[PDB]
């Protein structure tokens, strides 16, 4: 699926967290 | 934050206190977990100060091996906690579903969980309910703490799960962070064996076996796992093997084959 692609893109480049939510 | 802000994608399952769902954060496509809680519910059931501790200690704490709460919106009637999302879900399922870890996978587990819980343990956090059933896994299977039900910022509080208790808690004896020494040595052999060490019929026989630390390997453990085991599992908590002495134990540096997640 598109979803899977997207969630391993997410672990190998991820975002700033704690300045995107925190 | 609204949930107008999000894009609900499918139900992740039940969760404590509520619904958990997969969801992407419309504006930057990032994908997470959203638990949404009712608010009459958490008044119902008289739980607002226990969700409100677990939120507190949760939302400070920054390791990769425990489940990150990013922030957390309201509106009229739902509490919505936004949580990392934790792509191999249940720890426990795996375990049921293998019957029992292979070396490699349990030392990696356990470097982990010493690394997390030493983190906690610093900041004075005791977790007190380390078991297969509070953990989830992350993208490339590492261990993530996901319940911190009964955790404390630190006691004679009687907590956790029966085949997990420490001797001093059944005992009623006080207790201190030593616990989760105790417990983190009971679920590494639940992860090598598929069953808890002190496993019995009835609660008396568990309090027994646990109090007299009445520890029977099965013969398929090789000497390394059962020489870290029997370091955590002692009677005495200052005599536990300290979570820095699990990092660098043999045996979990010759089969844990962890790998940090990428940081931004
Ligand atoms: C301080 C207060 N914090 C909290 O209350 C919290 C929380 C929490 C609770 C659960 C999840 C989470 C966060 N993130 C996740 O990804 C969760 C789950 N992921 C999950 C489920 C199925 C699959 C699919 N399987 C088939 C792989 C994958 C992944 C999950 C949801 C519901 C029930 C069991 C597990």
């Not at chain 2, 992407?24 to 809680?37: D, G, H, P, S, T």
């Not at chain 2, 078991?131 to 009964?150: C, H, R, S, T, V």
């Amino acid at each position: 699926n598109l979803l899977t692609q997207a969630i391993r893109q997410q672990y190998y480049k991820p975002i700033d967290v704690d300045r995107m939510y925190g | 934050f609204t949930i107008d802000d999000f894009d609900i994608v499918r139900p992740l399952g039940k969760g404590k206190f509520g619904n958990v769902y997969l969801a992407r954060e419309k504006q930057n496509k990032f994908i997470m977990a959203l638990k949404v809680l009712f608010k009459s519910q958490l008044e119902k059931e008289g739980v607002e100060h226990q969700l409100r501790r677990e939120i507190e200690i949760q939302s400070h704490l920054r390791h990769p091996n425990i489940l990150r709460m990013y922030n957390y919106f309201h509106d009229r009637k739902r509490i919505y906690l936004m949580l990392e999302f934790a792509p191999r879900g249940e720890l426990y399922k795996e375990l049921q579903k293998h019957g029992r870890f292979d070396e490699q996978r349990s030392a990696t587990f356990m470097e982990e969980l010493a690394d997390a819980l030493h983190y906690c343990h610093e900041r004075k956090v005791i977790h007190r309910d380390i078991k297969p059933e509070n953990l989830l896994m992350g993208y490339k299977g590492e261990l993530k703490i996901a319940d911190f039900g009964w955790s404390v910022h630190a006691r004679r509080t009687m907590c956790g799960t029966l085949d997990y208790l420490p001797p001093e808690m059944i005992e009623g004896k006080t207790h201190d962070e030593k616990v989760d020494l105790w417990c983190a040595g009971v679920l590494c052999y639940e992860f090598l064996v598929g069953m808890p060490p002190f496993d019995s019929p009835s609660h008396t026989e568990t309090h027994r076996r646990i109090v007299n630390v009445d520890l029977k390997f099965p013969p398929f453990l090789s000497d390394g796992s059962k020489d870290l085991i029997s370091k955590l599992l002692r009677y005495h908590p200052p005599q536990r093997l300290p979570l820095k002495g699990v990092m660098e134990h043999p045996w979990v540096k010759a089969n844990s084959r962890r790998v940090l997640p990428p940081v931004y």
